[model samples]
Target: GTVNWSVEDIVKGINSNNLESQLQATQAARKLLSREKQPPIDNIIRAGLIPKFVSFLGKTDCSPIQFESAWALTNIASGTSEQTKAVVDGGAIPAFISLLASPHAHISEQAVWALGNIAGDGSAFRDLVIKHGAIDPLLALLAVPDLSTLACGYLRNLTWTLSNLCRNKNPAPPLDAVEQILPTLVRLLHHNDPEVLADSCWAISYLTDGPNERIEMVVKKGVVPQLVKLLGATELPIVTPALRAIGNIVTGTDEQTQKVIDAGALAVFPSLLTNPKTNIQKEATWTMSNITAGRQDQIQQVVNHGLVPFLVGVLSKADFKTQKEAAWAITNYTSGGTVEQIVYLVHCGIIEPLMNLLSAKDTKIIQVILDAISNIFQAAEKLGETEKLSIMIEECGGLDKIEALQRHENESVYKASLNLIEKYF
Candidate 1:
């Protein structure tokens, strides 16, 4: 039941300084996007007035006008498979690309969003977009001190588009084209806008996913601790994404794994386990797993802080993914033969639930189960209860593989397994 304002009404509203009418028109277009039943692209593009709207966008000083024009076009460009093709075929692509160079924040923000919709389609638009100088405008927006909010949205959309662009089967623009933008992207992390800063962190984390020198360069620019601080802030909604970024970074290498915790990350995550937001708690559990895998010291730190109760809570009702993460953290922390904590985990009725996770289809879950059984074996040995170790090992499998501790996808997991093997031998 959304209204569709004619292009003339939208134009008149903008030129007459009717902010309310302009916002209403924008809302109507965005509503067209939200309704599952609407034919937004046909209605907007079939009108054949998008070029007029784009021209107005080029000259409009009104935020509402620029914002509304961008919204209407974004809905048309981003709508459906056919709609994306239509927007491109209608020759709107070049104009949208040009809006990226507009001096207005709202205009630039909308252009990035439209590009994201198009690039995300994984079509021919991706190559044409990058070739049209989209990157320069995005990098320029990053430098605008007063446009942090708009900059955040713009940069995030642009980076997401680029991420998809890389995923496209067609060869992407040169790696140097991507790499040349890294310094500017990293600089966005220091922006005062929490949304900008947090998203910049997220974008950088994804772009740096593989082992490359550029990722290391960004880390050296002081991003890890800033990400940790964001995770610990509790005031912002960005914690989950920040934690996910931290997780990806640590997963890259053992050195990054240790660096995250040494940045005072471990000190803050134990309490975050109890946060009401399920996603934040889930990401925190993930960060805890990688930290414990690398630092046995973190286990005592968490157990001494009474995380066993909360971890037990996660183990109680958690789904397979959360259980796997909880088990990994527990196993890592107890690798140093922390019998007190292992026994506490057992006493809290966590063993059966954890043992159930051995059936988890994920290879990583299988590894955590092995590590947990190893911890139980070590605990029983320290208590001189050799029979218990044999019983649990026999019930599970053989302790033979525990000694080998199969290499994990993460390098830190491999190194941590080696250190634990050396300790027992």
Candidate 2:
């Protein structure tokens, strides 16, 4: 006869003097917690199963008990914030941190998984994991060839933990500690596992998405070339985060953006624009937006790489989200570009799309398109080509669209429309 054990039965079995009983109890609890359609496990927590699982983390002599305990805690950490808080408040962090050093690979891997969820709960819990000394040990795992070679799964979880630690926004992690581990994180961009590579790129993205000092710190560590190398990856998962990281990096100072430009980012960006995935296309277009926001030479780098046609192409054919990003890129190029660069965009077939987009209901889209047109008209004036620019606008029926925007509800769009009529018409 098969007995359906109650929660108390499992607890008693786990607490028994017999090792086999304890293993069976731990395995049974783990199995129950892992089920897809089981009853709520909160009753198990109320019955004092959490502390027992936390205790099993210290049972290094028995691999099965340790693995089961850590695995159970991993699933528990995936529960409600309060449930995860119970694990953290029950001293599971230091226990899990210690398990990272266990000779058994599965034990260490499960501990990494547990800590990842704990840190992912929120900032306070994430900071608690970091405060309990999880950073150095986690970073140390990256340097171990044995771990990378024999425990690639472990490395994936480890990178995910590091990724979540950097995800804090309101109050970020210690910048110095994050800086210390960045080189290793950058090195992992070349790891063969796609998840590992994606998580590594995400970690870099979060870190650079902060204040300028952090961005400069990551840039100084020689992250640009590695990130550029990742831009060439065929996998969209890998390419998405890589684009995000590069996007954040280019938002730094001119020197920083120039470093990325020097690393051949422009050369690889055009292919990304035509990626099969729209999200990848969105991110790639957003990256161009930032690059175009750079200095004259940097903006010229975008032009030199022949991205103008692609930018114009996106405005004409991509989805609305991508079209908005393309508008941003064109807005920056027109605003900051030299006369030659502005004329290049006009010659690359920007006028028709610019005119066609004038009737867009999105105020942002209309405003940026107006801004681009205004800059182009001004550029034409400087080169004494305003007549030719006007002829092109008329050929595209842009004058009628500009006249129609005078009554636009958005103040900026209406004002920009009037300014163009007053200046160029």
Candidate 3:
């Protein structure tokens, strides 16, 4: 005869005085929690296994119990907010923090994993993990040779947690935590493990994406040179976050943007324009947008990189999302670019795509195209090439498209169209 275990039976096994009984129950709970589609975790909460798991955190005499308990709680924290709340409310955070100091590497690693899940839930729960003093121990773990000497996965998990803490919105991590961890994070960029490198890059990106005040903190820590060095990473996973981090950094003041350019980001940037992944291409293009938005020397850096041909190529053939970024890059270059850069863009074949994009229904695309055209003609007029540029536009039917936009619903489109007709036609 076979027997089916009720939730109560499982709960009884977890709370039993017998050690084997507790192990069987905890292991079973971990298996249940480990499922891809977890059984109703709230049901496990109702069975009172959460508090039992929390109590197991202090069971140092038994490493198996500690590992299984933390593993189960990690999975539970992976559940719905209410389920994760049950773990936090059951006093798991401080226990997990204490476990970080445990001599047993597995125990400390599992604790890091559990706390990361709690922090990943959302801001309020994340604040709970931070409030209970998780940051110091977690940051301290970075120096632990165990993390580096152990399996690469362990360090990856630790960095992932660190990245999540920096990922807060609205009321983010305390400034002291960011300031303390940043230099260490910059050092981690040299870590050989790709996963660790990716997560480390994400942490830098998150911090840079925070309050404008914090941007200077990372830049001052000398993060740009390291980030520029990472741009050459062959691994897309590593390169993606590295690009994202660099993208956000360049969004800071001109001084910050100049630091990246001075570090040779412009030289390596064009290679990414044709990267296999669309996201890489998109982010790389966005970096170009910001670079072109910088002062004349900065804009000239990208222009001198011979990006005009590639920028025009992307507008003609890349996906719409990427094309939008490409258009903005061209717009910035044309708006602030010197007469020689404008001529280079014209010679690189920008007119046909600029005219073709005029028929796009997306107001943003239309407006950028109009602005780029306006700047191109204005620059052309300065160099007495207006007649030549106007003939190119007329041949591309750009005049007809601008005339049609006069009745457009968007005010910017209508006004820009009117301005183009008055200036170029």
Candidate 4:
């Protein structure tokens, strides 16, 4: 016999211990709700059912009925192209906002989560969610202690969704909210639970970054040192993210790199360049390239750490991509320093490897080598070592041939070589 079930019965079934029965009842309820002759999901909110759902959402217990009902309602209400007018039309703004406090933390969390998801596509509910105070609850969740694994997973999803929602919006989560959450989130890096720590670090990383320089302020808070420490370890699961965060901090700001160098990061990273682990070596090489960009002092600190040996080692095994990176790092490091560094590199038999790379199939690889050699000669000229400088040019072939480098297959290489000849000759 087919049973005649009311909404309450279906809700109870959804909340029941019998998973099969609960699923069946929930499916049945979905069918009936879809068949209503009311407005489309977009317009249906205006038809007055939204407020009822919101009230139900706020007042509900953890019964499967309430969670399932809120889940279904959130799906429909937040749909693009078909706004749940019944939900919106019923003045659900305040009541929907209230659900952040449902007795079932899961339900409340889901409601806040749904509001953020649905806010995409310029929906009315988008601002309403923010206006009605979703940030406070979401930030509060980020601070809570001792979450079960399930709760931790949910929190990860919830925080990520909120961050995405907040990505481009201005008048962002309150300044107070940002302050309170960021330190707590960064502290999560110290947690014993690896997953929690990873997610927490990811959230903090995202929050610290922006189209604006919001991350610069956080860098000033002394986080880059911690991130650099994370990069130095063999067992840290957060290494990649740590590298990325350090990359972001150092990429465009000389001050940031100086901060890292001041905190001893420059001393630590060069070792990773020679790490036996392929990816770590590669990542460290690339990161050093970025951090040292345009800053000769920072670059020199890396050089003094015996970076040349490792750089040469990495260059020997480098593909076109890695070769270009290693060359650039060497270029920046030797640009303004003592002629001795350049002589050490040349006397150490590095020039041939760099010159060999000049004929590389990758034009960029060739360009990096040429640029590095040109910079080294310029540094030599400063030291008035025309003899050592001439030795370099003569090894590659004398002045005419070096000047003919202006016609090399790689235009950047030729330009770089010409720049050197113009300076030294």
| Candidate 3 Cα outliers beyond 4 Å, as residue runs | 1-6, 37-39, 144-148
| Number of the top TM-score candidate | 3
**Comparing 1 and 3 on TM-score, the stronger one:** 3
Where model 2 places Cα greater than 4 Å from the true spot, the runs are 1-8, 11-19, 37-39, 145-148
- Best lDDT among the predictions, by candidate number: 2
TM-score of each: 0.66, 0.93, 0.94, 0.67
Q: With candidate 2 superimposed using the best TM-score fit, by how many Å does residue 96's alpha carbon deviate from the native?
A: 0.9
Model 3, range 271-380, lDDT digits (tens) per residue? 88888799988999888888888888887777778877788888887878889998999898888888988888899899898788878879989989888888888888
Write model 4 residue lDDT over 1-425, tens digit each, in one string.
21444566665655566755655665455454555464234433443334444544444443454565566576676555346544555555455456666667776666665565554434344555566666676666656565443366566666555544433335444455466556655565565555555555555555555533666766756677677667665555566656656655666477766776777766666566666556656667777776546465665676777667777877767655666778777676566446666677766566656765654566666566666676777666677786666666567644555576678876667777787677676
CA shift of 380, model 4, Å: 1.7
RMSD of each: 8.4, 2.2, 2.3, 7.4
Model 2 scores worst on lDDT over the 10 consecutive residues at 1-10
TM-score, prediction 1: 0.66
Who is ahead in lDDT, 1 or 3? Answer: 3
> 131 in model 4: Cα distance from truth in Å?
4.9
* lDDT per residue (tens digit) for residues 215-260 in model 2: 8888888878988998899887888888898999888888998898
lDDT-wise, the better of 2 and 4 is: 2
Q: Against the unseen true structure, what C-alpha lDDT does each candidate score?
A: 0.63, 0.85, 0.84, 0.60
Off by over 4 Å in 4: 1-62, 69-98, 109-132, 142-177, 207-212, 233-237, 267-271, 274-282, 294-297, 336-349, 361-365, 384-405, 408-413, 418-425
Better of 3 and 4 by lDDT: 3
Worst lDDT run of 10 residues, candidate 1, spans: 397-406
Alpha-carbon shift of residue 220 in model 4 (angstroms): 2.9
